[PDB]
Design a protein around this ligand. Sequence first.
Ligand SMILES: *CC(=O)Nc1ccc(NC(=O)C*)cc1
Ligand SMILES: [N]
Lengths: 11, 166
Amino acid sequence: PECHIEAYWCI
Amino acid sequence: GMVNPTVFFDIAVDGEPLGRVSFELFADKVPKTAENFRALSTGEKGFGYKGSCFHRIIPGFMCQGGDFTRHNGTGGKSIYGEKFEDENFILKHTGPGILSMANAGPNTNGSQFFICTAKTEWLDGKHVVFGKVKEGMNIVEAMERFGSRNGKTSKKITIADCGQLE
Ligand SMILES: *CC(=O)Nc1ccc(NC(=O)C*)cc1
Ligand SMILES: [N]
């Protein structure tokens, strides 16, 4: 996974 | 008396020169991560950032690049192998210009990186901050205008040249 994209997506 | 390295990217839009972005690298705070980016900018290990593109650009978020191996945004490798541990999380994502490492979990740092165009505090503790835009932030702002909401770029945003200034 791309953790900073997934963080952006969750936010 | 020991000075943080300064590196530059000459950005090109479909081969057209756009402008220079220079970065301070916080070797004082994260020596291993700063050295990875420094040497990938010089190519002095036989490989690095030159010619690679910014493959994901999300306005209001960041400009991502660093995959110089497959170029599709899944590749890239560090100077230590293919991945190296999270050095530390001392420095924070404080605002635009912050230079941070992309990863796929803890201790999966490669060569992919992103330049923040906003404050991203929700990335603290998961992605290692190692540098900051010194000059040319107006050039990063122009790169942002070629991005989209899923990161797809409308033109080829490439690192036409890169190296070390200090
Ligand atoms: C790789 C990784 O850490 N991904 C990830 C998934 C979900 C979230 N969720 C929120 O931030 C609410 C963050 C990171
Ligand atoms: N989000």
